[PDB]
Amino acid sequence: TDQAAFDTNIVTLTRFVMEQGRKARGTGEMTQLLNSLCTAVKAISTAVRKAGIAHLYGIAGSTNVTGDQVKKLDVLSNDLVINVLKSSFATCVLVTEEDKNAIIVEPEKRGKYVVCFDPLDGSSNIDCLVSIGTIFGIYRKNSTDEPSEKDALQPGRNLVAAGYALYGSATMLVLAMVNGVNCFMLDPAIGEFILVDRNVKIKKKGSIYSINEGYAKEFDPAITEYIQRKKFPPDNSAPYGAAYVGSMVADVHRTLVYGGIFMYPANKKSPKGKLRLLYECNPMAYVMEKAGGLATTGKEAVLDIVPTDIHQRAPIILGSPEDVTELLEIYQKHAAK
Amino acid sequence: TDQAAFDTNIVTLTRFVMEQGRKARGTGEMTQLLNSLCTAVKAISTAVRKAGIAHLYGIAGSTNVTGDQVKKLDVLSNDLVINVLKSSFATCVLVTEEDKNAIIVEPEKRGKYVVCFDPLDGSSNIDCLVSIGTIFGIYRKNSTDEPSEKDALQPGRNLVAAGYALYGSATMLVLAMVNGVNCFMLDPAIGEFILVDRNVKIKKKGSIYSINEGYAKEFDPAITEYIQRKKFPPDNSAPYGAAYVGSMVADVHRTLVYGGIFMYPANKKSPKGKLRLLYECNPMAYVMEKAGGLATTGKEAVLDIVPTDIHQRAPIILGSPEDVTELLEIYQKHAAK
Amino acid sequence: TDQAAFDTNIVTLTRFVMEQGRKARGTGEMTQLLNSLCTAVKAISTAVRKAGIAHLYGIAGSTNVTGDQVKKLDVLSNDLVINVLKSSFATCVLVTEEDKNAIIVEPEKRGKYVVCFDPLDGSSNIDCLVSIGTIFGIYRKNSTDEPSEKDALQPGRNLVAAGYALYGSATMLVLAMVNGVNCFMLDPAIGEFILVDRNVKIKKKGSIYSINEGYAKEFDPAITEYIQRKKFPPDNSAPYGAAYVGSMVADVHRTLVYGGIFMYPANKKSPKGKLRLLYECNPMAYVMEKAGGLATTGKEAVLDIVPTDIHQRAPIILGSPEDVTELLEIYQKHAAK
Amino acid sequence: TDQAAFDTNIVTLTRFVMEQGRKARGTGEMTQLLNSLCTAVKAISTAVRKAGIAHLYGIAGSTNVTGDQVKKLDVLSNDLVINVLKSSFATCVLVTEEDKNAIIVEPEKRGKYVVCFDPLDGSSNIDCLVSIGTIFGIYRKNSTDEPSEKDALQPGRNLVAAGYALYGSATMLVLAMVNGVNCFMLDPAIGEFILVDRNVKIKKKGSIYSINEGYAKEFDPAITEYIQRKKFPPDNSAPYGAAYVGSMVADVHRTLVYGGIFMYPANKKSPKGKLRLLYECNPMAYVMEKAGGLATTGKEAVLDIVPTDIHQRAPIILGSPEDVTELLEIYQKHAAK
Ligand SMILES: Nc1ncnc2c1ncn2[C@@H]1O[C@H](COP(=O)(O)O)[C@@H](O)[C@H]1O
Ligand SMILES: Nc1ncnc2c1ncn2[C@@H]1O[C@H](COP(=O)(O)O)[C@@H](O)[C@H]1O
Ligand SMILES: Nc1ncnc2c1ncn2[C@@H]1O[C@H](COP(=O)(O)O)[C@@H](O)[C@H]1O
Ligand SMILES: Nc1ncnc2c1ncn2[C@@H]1O[C@H](COP(=O)(O)O)[C@@H](O)[C@H]1O
Ligand SMILES: O=P(O)(O)OC[C@H]1O[C@](O)(CO)[C@@H](O)[C@@H]1O
Ligand SMILES: O=P(O)(O)OC[C@H]1O[C@](O)(CO)[C@@H](O)[C@@H]1O
Ligand SMILES: O=P(O)(O)OC[C@H]1O[C@](O)(CO)[C@@H](O)[C@@H]1O
Ligand SMILES: O=P(O)(O)OC[C@H]1O[C@](O)(CO)[C@@H](O)[C@@H]1O
């Protein structure tokens, strides 16, 4: 239909999440989950921007207050997430990058959702103030057996919601569900997330490739060929621009926005790549697909891999459909016997 | 202890600049200047993070406060700097990347410093929330004639202070003056820059090379041979990892902290490089040399180039001394006559 | 029952409002309303604290941006409220202090709730930075006739929710519903309201009275007697302390917290007092009563007055039960024939 | 125009203080001091507003960062000031309301100024979110002996600068030095104090009297007669409205802006008044006289009292000159021998 009116639309994430839940006739359990996620992200954003740093540096002579050892944006971000999620009384299992084991939410606080997240992604290089972020994936528990590690082992095809929080020159939460991908910019003055982009679709063909070429020595012939074709185009066309931040969320977001292709392939050292399946690959692949792009491992789609370990790694190539395809053809070409 | 010089306490940019002024027995004109940059950076930072975006999206109606198409972060940032600077009564001429012509300060507000700045660097690419910055270089007006554009045409070697602010996961102002380089962390909560790194010195040798390889088709044989030797080390050592954000302040900063080399050479299809000399090359070079690195154009040193125009471009290479010298060797190996 | 556990309770207003709605099995219309109210308050808080003031004062040389005339925290606060409430698609009628007429929400955006509010209370004296606030009252529309001014004319006994936002040394939103009164402190860094007080009950007897004694000349004998008994106690006990800010929300909150009595009686100039019934008296009376206190006009309870005009005024006395009672007895004593 | 003196631009506290230092040909020691107060106020302001209260309430677990019973805004504020002050290398002795003894600065950080401050004024009453403040007075150490408590015992008349910060609906720093009074508005977004009111002068006569009438039973006949004449004007004029927050900085500030008179006289049950001389009475008096008001104890002028102890109390009356003189008349009318 055609909506005709005197309409002003200042749509916040909270209003959005609630309405969407109303439409779906959910019991509001997921609403509370998402609302809790939004609160965790904001708190992390604030910490990442170093609000309150003056105190570590004794502006008020740290009498003890925050205590002597480290509050590593790394672990702090973890605790903020697990804590905020458990208090939502909506998650039964949590799987985090920082935790060796899947955390089973106390019986008193259990829900029917499983969240796989990466508290602070790209953190290893925070010293140079590179854009870092949070990645999250949510599955609905598919059983009646006591929630165990096993419930997290579901292909990304089974995710009910997924997305990320980019703490770049500004903070953004990109949320993707069955209905589509939407971007929300955080107005830090009022602590609200404003819908700035609705139904985000990725360009069919982009003009930028993203890969850490320092590994060129260990790249497989399919990758080495694609890359060569990006720099020296055989139709004598314009070459692709290159750009690689070293932080997945930042690279993936740049791909979603301007289009192109991101790759973190298998190289001889990490035969199965470096990026972990459950909390990095899946979420980004799911986003990519709802956004209209492709996300493959080179042989198969990422969302269809059935995991066997929560910390399983997996190669990944994602981005505009025409580029991802163009590379996949090369894989088929060099695939033999 | 025989220390007339203490780091157990908390030192803000404002205390720091001021102490440095007392020591230098300045009349206090440069201090009002440095204090104005501090206020400028803080203001642009807040805008970059999107504080207040709610109003633009109609949280109170986009009547005449929102309206449209007028405020472009870059233009705002330009205005803030030019304005906060004139209001210091310390500048006589200002060269801006957003202004075709040099700006001569009204005789009332006229001072003695010449300031060259790039207000919002890397802001073509801001849509994908990439880290951006602001770059500045300050010369002492060395003349007696009515101030003019010519006062801005002094080789980088004559700078009295230079530096930049990086708006990334956090806001940081790196300031380099005659004595050395110092890094101040913005505590957004109190609007104060804290001293976290004193006398920053770059590594002799790093393990990261930064360049836009999308242009590999148009690099000179020296650059080409260099990149090659990094990926495929002849002495069988471990290859150099690659990283490229596409934002000067961000790459330069990564280079300063982790070491390595950043290059933006004379790429065919733009023979004089792309980065501008006065407000991009010179400041980063000044910082670099102050941190113990090198900043070469391939043939000569960046800071010694005599500008012929305020908007002049130049190719540039900077970073750890061992890496920058290594490429220089290759540069000699390939031509002269 | 007895809840026994490993429980951490970081209860935000959003989580609270949602859960309470879940219990009540509401369609979530009121949830969205309350969520929208929370967003309006935060935005007002931010503006009241003068965030961004540097721009009115040309820090970036107001090129036009916010435009030439006034953005009176007074009217701005109004627009923020009406706008945010209409966009919730949950209100059919709004009654504000700043508006002569009851605003009938567009058909496309109607809901079944009526909100009577005071955008910025105590605003007349903002110049001296006195604590100001927002007062709101919510009724459910009791009919099928097209929502008209008439739907706002319901005794305070009919309110479904009521409360206020105090922008004092910190911001607090006191929310009262059928189930009780709760206080939420705003952590401005993350823009969230934290439950800091649960089921707030007022002291039976307080030791502070609040009244503008400058009107002593026009006070009725009942008031004049009570006041005299507060200063010179006939049992030679300790006199009451006095305190009157001149801003209703600030006075009422101090009464709720420490206990005592607040009075804004009828004096010969305003035979029916100054405080308006629908958006000041009712809300505060409702809060007071759920909190365990009393709120009378001197003759009858405020919550039971059936209004005849939306801008009707009404005398008011509220506070601890023992004090309010002690004064009411005096009224009965001097009430004759 | 013949103005070597402009107000069309934006003036921050930092630019202001610094200009004032150049003019006064200061060595720059008092400027580092005033710059330290500025940083101090900003830090306490942020804390007062409760930025970060989430962590205390377990948003990331109250492990050891929260724990308990240690941080009391007043104690924190005390620490911040003492600490930020010592770190200026401009103070030799500090008198604090929270410290039984005067604090002598380590010879390393030792300067020449004596600072008397009340860190969190009106903070017994902070529970009800009443506006609070910080008061400061600065003397030049006029002696040669090893600095001691005695340097703080100088009559108010010897102050070089005095002022206060009010944490109310917004944060304001009012600063009064030899030339006059100036009001700086804190733009919390950029952490900068903006000059909004220059050369503040109080009204000759105002229409508001401020006093705690709960004590009317113990006022001397002069105060009693005065209050009476305000409520029941003998010349049949309109009565004086009353207002009393119970927070010095707040009442004093209301008095400065709207005019009128503030009184806290020698109330039986505390014969020397309640307000302390060094850090409450003297600063407000200094400001007052600088704004064109009067500050009397009833018999003598507050600023001329020679202190005998740093924690000495004194009765005080201040405000518009016509009102303060009027009570003084009544004070003469009632006694001498
Ligand atoms: N925005 C949303 N909020 C809540 N439920 C949603 C939302 N969008 C879709 N739904 C669906 O509602 C289902 C019911 O889950 P629940 O509320 O836990 O009983 C969810 O699992 C989702 O599939
Ligand atoms: N923080 C500082 N403030 C003022 N001048 C300084 C500072 N640090 C070093 N200087 C030197 O002192 C000279 C004095 O210049 P001016 O303040 O205008 O009188 C400057 O040009 C600098 O070379
Ligand atoms: N926190 C709350 N959120 C929503 N509904 C509530 C809440 N507390 C009580 N309820 C009741 O649920 C009723 C249903 O209204 P509605 O959701 O508009 O259909 C409301 O009018 C309230 O009486
Ligand atoms: N903003 C200012 N900074 C420094 N001194 C000032 C200022 N305004 C006035 N003065 C006067 O200058 C004297 C110089 O003291 P000092 O800075 O320590 O050398 C101070 O004691 C004041 O009386
Ligand atoms: O720069 P490299 O060595 O190619 O790997 C960095 C990658 O590792 C991660 O930190 C996590 O696996 C990603 O954010 C990032 O893309
Ligand atoms: O995409 P390109 O052409 O390689 O350019 C990015 C370069 O230009 C700039 O974006 C100029 O703003 C620099 O920050 C950066 O080094
Ligand atoms: O100080 P007065 O004259 O007694 O009246 C002030 C009253 O008016 C109001 O501004 C609104 O009616 C209240 O906030 C306040 O209590
Ligand atoms: O309630 P009282 O005894 O009248 O005192 C309030 C007075 O004491 C103080 O609260 C001291 O902090 C002052 O701010 C104020 O003027």
Q: Is the dihedral of CA C49, C52, C56, C57 positive or negative?
A: positive
CA A309 → CA A155, A279, A317, distances in Å? 12, 12, 21
The reply to whether C1 falls in a domain is: no
Helix axis angle, C29-48 to A13-24, nearest 10°: 180
The encoded tokens of residue D128 equal 């009800």
Angle at A200 between CA A18 and CA B63, to 5 degrees: 70
Q: Atom 12 in ligand 7: which residue has the minimum CA distance?
A: C275
End-to-end CA distance of chain A: 53
Among A167, A209, A214, beta carbon nearest to B169: A167
SS (H, E, C) B254-287: HHHHHCCEEEECCCCCCCCCCCEHHHHHHHHHHH
Q: Is D99 a known active-site residue?
A: no
The reply to whether B2 falls in a domain is: no
Q: Which of C190, C201, C176 minimizes the C-alpha distance to C291?
A: C201
CA distance linking residue C18 with residue C34, whole number of Å: 9
Q: In this structure, are residues D244 and D210 in contact, taking their beta carbons and an 8 Å threshold?
A: yes
Q: Which of B155, B196, B204, B160 minimizes the C-alpha distance to B178?
A: B160
How far is it between the farthest Cα atoms of chain C? 70
Helix axis angle, C282-290 to C248-258, nearest 10°: 10
CA distance linking residue C206 with residue C251, whole number of Å: 14
Q: Check pocket membership of A31 for ligand 1, CB cut-off 6 A.
A: yes
Residue type, B88: S
Q: Which helix (H) or strand (E) holds C328?
A: helix C321-334
Report the SS3 class of residue D191: coil
The reply to whether C2 falls in a domain is: no
CA D94 → CA C282, D81, D118, distances in Å? 50, 10, 11
Label residues C302-331 b or e (16+ Cβ within 10 Å = b).
bbebebeebbebbbbbbbbbbbbeebbebb
List beta partners, residue A167.
Answer: A132, A171
Q: Which helix (H) or strand (E) holds A283?
A: helix A282-290
Q: In this structure, are residues B258 and B208 in contact, taking their beta carbons and an 8 Å threshold?
A: yes
CA C15 → CA A115, A127, C142, D41, D59, distances in Å? 19, 35, 28, 34, 13
CA B231 → CA B15, C258, D136, distances in Å? 46, 72, 63
Q: In this structure, are residues B323 and B209 in contact, taking their beta carbons and an 8 Å threshold?
A: yes
C-beta atoms of D15 and B9 within 8 A: no
Q: In this structure, are residues D114 and D105 in contact, taking their beta carbons and an 8 Å threshold?
A: no
CA distance linking residue C271 with residue A154, whole number of Å: 72
Report the SS3 class of residue C263: strand
Domain stop point among A153, A181, A199: A199
CA distance linking residue A181 with residue A10, whole number of Å: 18
C-beta atoms of D57 and C189 within 8 A: no
CA C184 → CA C202, C252, D17, D57, distances in Å? 17, 16, 39, 12
Domain stop point among B199, B220, B252: B199
Ramachandran quadrant class, A222 (left: phi over 0; alpha: psi -120 to 50; beta: rest): alpha
Do A26 and A126 belong together in one domain? yes
**Helices (H), ranges, chain D:** 13-23, 29-48, 53-56, 73-86, 221-231, 248-258, 282-291, 321-334
User: What Å resolution does this PDB entry report?
Assistant: 2.2
**Helices (H), ranges, C25-119:** 29-48, 73-86
CA distance linking residue B317 with residue A135, whole number of Å: 35
Q: In this structure, are residues B60 and C46 in contact, taking their beta carbons and an 8 Å threshold?
A: no
Angle at B15 between CA B13 and CA B16, to 5 degrees: 60
Q: In this structure, are residues B184 and B334 in contact, taking their beta carbons and an 8 Å threshold?
A: no
B272 CA distance to ligand 5 middle (Å):
34
CA distance linking residue D172 with residue D292, whole number of Å: 20
Do D43 and D143 belong together in one domain? yes
How far is it between the farthest Cα atoms of chain A? 70
Report the SS3 class of residue C52: coil
Q: Which of D308, D19, A36, D72 minimizes the C-alpha distance to C11?
A: A36
Q: What secondary structure letter does DSSP report for D171?
A: E
The encoded tokens of residue C36 equal 């929208």
Nearest atom in ligand 1 to the alpha carbon of residue A28 is 17
Q: What secondary structure letter does DSSP report for C125?
A: G
Do B174 and B275 belong together in one domain? no
In the set D34, D94, D120, D327, the catalytic residue is D120
Do B164 and B229 belong together in one domain? no
The domain of D12 spans: 7-199
List beta partners, residue D134.
Answer: D165
The encoded tokens of residue D21 equal 């230092």
Nearest ligand, CA B92: 2
Do B160 and B59 belong together in one domain? yes
Q: In this structure, are residues C213 and D242 in contact, taking their beta carbons and an 8 Å threshold?
A: yes
CA distance linking residue C260 with residue C254, whole number of Å: 9
**β-pair type (C159-167, C132-140):** antiparallel
How far is it between the farthest Cα atoms of chain D? 68
Q: In this structure, are residues D188 and C49 in contact, taking their beta carbons and an 8 Å threshold?
A: yes
Q: In this structure, are residues B13 and B41 in contact, taking their beta carbons and an 8 Å threshold?
A: no
Phi, psi dihedral angles at A330 (to 5 degrees): -65, -40
Do D227 and D169 belong together in one domain? no
C-beta atoms of C190 and A108 within 8 A: no
Residues of A in contact with B186 (CB under 8 A): 50
How is B305-334 classified by DSSP, letter by letter? ---SSTT-B--EEEE-HHHHHHHHHHHHHH
Report the SS3 class of residue C195: strand
Please identify among residues 38-67 of chain C the ones whose CB lies closer than 8 Å to any CB of chain D: 48-54, 57-59
Q: Which helix (H) or strand (E) holds B76?
A: helix B73-86
**Helices (H), ranges, C95-220:** none
A240 CA distance to ligand 6 middle (Å):
14
From D186, which residue of chain C is nearest by alpha-carbon distance?
Answer: C50
Q: In this structure, are residues D278 and D303 in contact, taking their beta carbons and an 8 Å threshold?
A: no
Burial of C77 (0-12, 13-18, 19+ CB in 10 A): buried
List beta partners, residue D103.
Answer: D94
Do B17 and B55 belong together in one domain? yes
Helix axis angle, B13-23 to B29-48, nearest 10°: 160
The reply to whether A313 falls in a domain is: yes
The reply to whether B81 falls in a domain is: yes
The encoded tokens of residue B179 equal 């004595």
The encoded tokens of residue B275 equal 């980065």
How near does any CA of chain D get to the CA of A175, in Å? 23
In the set C73, C94, C118, C303, the catalytic residue is C118
From D52, which residue of chain A is nearest by alpha-carbon distance?
Answer: A52
Q: Is the dihedral of CA D168, D171, D172, D173 positive or negative?
A: positive
Q: In this structure, are residues A276 and A313 in contact, taking their beta carbons and an 8 Å threshold?
A: yes
**β-pair type (C180-187, C192-197):** antiparallel
Residues of D in contact with C54 (CB under 8 A): 10, 187, 189-190, 192, 194
Q: Which helix (H) or strand (E) holds C269?
A: none
Q: After which residues is chain A broken (C to N over 2.5 A)?
A: none
CA C304 → CA C15, C215, C293, distances in Å? 32, 27, 15
Q: Check pocket membership of D122 for ligand 8, CB cut-off 6 A.
A: yes
Number of domains, chain C = 2
How is B205-229 classified by DSSP, letter by letter? S-SEEE--GGGGGG--HHHHHHHHH
C-beta atoms of C15 and A87 within 8 A: yes
Q: In this structure, are residues C265 and C220 in contact, taking their beta carbons and an 8 Å threshold?
A: yes
Residue type, B261: I
How is D222-244 classified by DSSP, letter by letter? HHHHHHHHHHS-TT--PPPEE-B
Q: Which residue has the tokens 């962390």?
A: B185
How many Cα atoms occupy the beta-carbon half-sphere of C155 within 13 Å?
8
Do B307 and B250 belong together in one domain? yes
How many residues in chain A? Answer: 337
The reply to whether C325 falls in a domain is: yes
B243 CA distance to ligand 6 middle (Å):
14
List beta partners, residue D104.
Answer: D93
CA distance linking residue B146 with residue C256, whole number of Å: 68
The reply to whether D1 falls in a domain is: no
Burial of C301 (0-12, 13-18, 19+ CB in 10 A): middle
Q: What CATH number does residue B114 fall under?
A: 3.30.540.10
Q: In this structure, are residues B259 and B206 in contact, taking their beta carbons and an 8 Å threshold?
A: yes
**Helices (H), ranges, D119-269:** 221-231, 248-258
Residues of D in contact with C196 (CB under 8 A): 53, 57
Ligand 2 pocket test: which of B30, B115, B139, B175 has the largest number of ligand atoms within 8 Å of its C-beta? Answer: B30
Burial of D205 (0-12, 13-18, 19+ CB in 10 A): middle
Q: Check pocket membership of C30 for ligand 3, CB cut-off 6 A.
A: yes
Q: Which of D284, D21, D328, D324 minimizes the C-alpha distance to D137?
A: D284
Q: Which of D167, D208, B193, D15 minimizes the C-alpha distance to A54?
A: B193
The reply to whether A2 falls in a domain is: no
Label residues D15-25 b or e (16+ Cβ within 10 Å = b).
bbbbebbeeee
CA distance linking residue B18 with residue B31, whole number of Å: 6
Q: In this structure, are residues A230 and A209 in contact, taking their beta carbons and an 8 Å threshold?
A: yes
Q: In this structure, are residues A122 and A133 in contact, taking their beta carbons and an 8 Å threshold?
A: yes
What count of other Cβ atoms lies within 10 Å of the Cβ of residue D330?
A: 18
Report the SS3 class of residue D200: coil
CA distance linking residue A195 with residue B58, whole number of Å: 12
Q: Is the dihedral of CA C169, C175, C181, C186 positive or negative?
A: negative
Nearest ligand, CA C130: 7
Angle at A163 between CA A160 and CA A168, to 5 degrees: 170
How is C216-236 classified by DSSP, letter by letter? GGG--HHHHHHHHHHHS-TT-
Label residues D144-177 b or e (16+ Cβ within 10 Å = b).
eeebeeebbbbbbeebebbbbbbbbbbbbbbbbb
How many Cα atoms occupy the beta-carbon half-sphere of B235 within 13 Å?
4
Q: The sheet that has A103-104: what strands, in order across it?
A: A103-104, A91-96, A113-121, A132-140, A159-167, A171-177, A180-187, A192-197
Question: Radius of gyration (Cα) for chain A, nearest Å?
Answer: 21
What count of other Cβ atoms lies within 10 Å of the Cβ of residue A332?
A: 10
Q: In this structure, are residues C303 and C297 in contact, taking their beta carbons and an 8 Å threshold?
A: no
Do C69 and C216 belong together in one domain? no
**Determination technique for this entry:** X-ray
Do D195 and D211 belong together in one domain? no
CA distance linking residue C47 with residue D93, whole number of Å: 39
Among B169, B186, B250, beta carbon nearest to A132: B169
The encoded tokens of residue D131 equal 């506006």
Q: Is the dihedral of CA C47, C52, C54, C57 positive or negative?
A: negative
Ramachandran quadrant class, A97 (left: phi over 0; alpha: psi -120 to 50; beta: rest): alpha
Q: Which residue has the tokens 């009224």?
A: C331
Question: Radius of gyration (Cα) for chain D, nearest Å?
Answer: 21
How is A80-142 classified by DSSP, letter by letter? HHHHHHHTTT-EEEEEETT-SS-EE--GGG--SEEEEEEEEETGGGGGGT--EEEEEEEEE--
What count of other Cβ atoms lies within 10 Å of the Cβ of residue A195?
A: 18
Report the SS3 class of residue D88: coil
Do B269 and B307 belong together in one domain? yes
The encoded tokens of residue A22 equal 């109303």
Q: Is C159 a known active-site residue?
A: no
Q: Name, in order, each residue with C-beta under 8 angstroms of C233's C-beta and a sequence gap of 6 or more.
A: C239
Q: Is the dihedral of CA A221, A223, A226, A230 positive or negative?
A: negative
**β-pair type (A91-96, A113-121):** parallel
Q: What secondary structure letter does DSSP report for A262?
A: E
Q: What CATH number does residue C238 fall under?
A: 3.40.190.80
Domain stop point among A169, A199, A229: A199
Q: Which of D137, D79, C189, D9 minimizes the C-alpha distance to A43?
A: C189
How many residues in chain D? Answer: 337
Q: Which of D178, D184, D173, D164 minimizes the C-alpha distance to D11?
A: D184
CA D145 → CA D116, D148, D306, distances in Å? 19, 8, 20
CA distance linking residue A233 with residue A41, whole number of Å: 42
List beta partners, residue B303.
Answer: none
Q: In this structure, are residues C117 and C94 in contact, taking their beta carbons and an 8 Å threshold?
A: yes
What count of other Cβ atoms lies within 10 Å of the Cβ of residue D94?
A: 20
Residues of B in contact with D84 (CB under 8 A): 10
Do A204 and A183 belong together in one domain? no
Burial of B207 (0-12, 13-18, 19+ CB in 10 A): middle
CA distance linking residue D256 with residue D200, whole number of Å: 8
The encoded tokens of residue C140 equal 């459910």
Residues of D in contact with A43 (CB under 8 A): 54, 59-60
Please identify among residues 71-110 of chain A the ones whose CB lies closer than 8 Å to any CB of chain B: none
Report the SS3 class of residue C210: strand
Helix then strand then coil, in percent of chain A rounded to 5, is 35, 25, 40
Q: Is the dihedral of CA B43, B47, B51, B53 positive or negative?
A: positive
